[PDB]
Amino acid sequence: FLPILASLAAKFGPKLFSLVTKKS
Fold first, then answer.
1. Alpha-carbon span 9 to 24, nearest angstrom
2. What's the CA gap between 7 and 1, in Å, rounded?
3. Which helix (H) or strand (E) holds 19?
4. How far, in Å, CA of 23 to CA of 15, rounded?
5. Sign of torsion over alpha carbons 6, 10, 14, 15
6. What angle do CA 15, 8, 6 make, to 5 degrees?
7. How far is CA 13 from CA 2, 5, 8, in A?
8. Backbone region of residue 2 per phi and psi (left: phi > 0; alpha: psi in -120 to 50; beta: other values)
9. Segment 9-13 long-range contacts (CB within 8 Å, at least 24 positions apart)
10. Is-contact 9 1, C-beta < 8 A?
11. Cα(19)–Cα(2) distance, rounded to whole angstroms?
12. Local structure of residue 20 (DSSP, 8 states)
C-alpha cells in the first residue's frame, strides 16, 4: 500500500477497521 496512506492508516488504528473489514 502507498506509504503516505499507510502512515495515516496505521496511525489512526487499523485494528478497529480490520475486525469488520470496515469501520471509519
1. 10
2. 10
3. helix 14-19
4. 10
5. positive
6. 80
7. 16, 12, 9
8. beta
9. none
10. yes
11. 21
12. T
Written as nine digits, the cell of 17 is 477497521
* Cell numbers describing residue 11: 496511525
Cell of 20: 469488520
The DSSP 8-state label assigned to residue 5 in this structure reads H
**Nearest-5° Cα angle at 2, 24 to 10:** 45
Report the distance separating Cα 4 and Cα 20, nearest Å.
Answer: 23
**Rounded CA separation 13/10 (Å):** 6
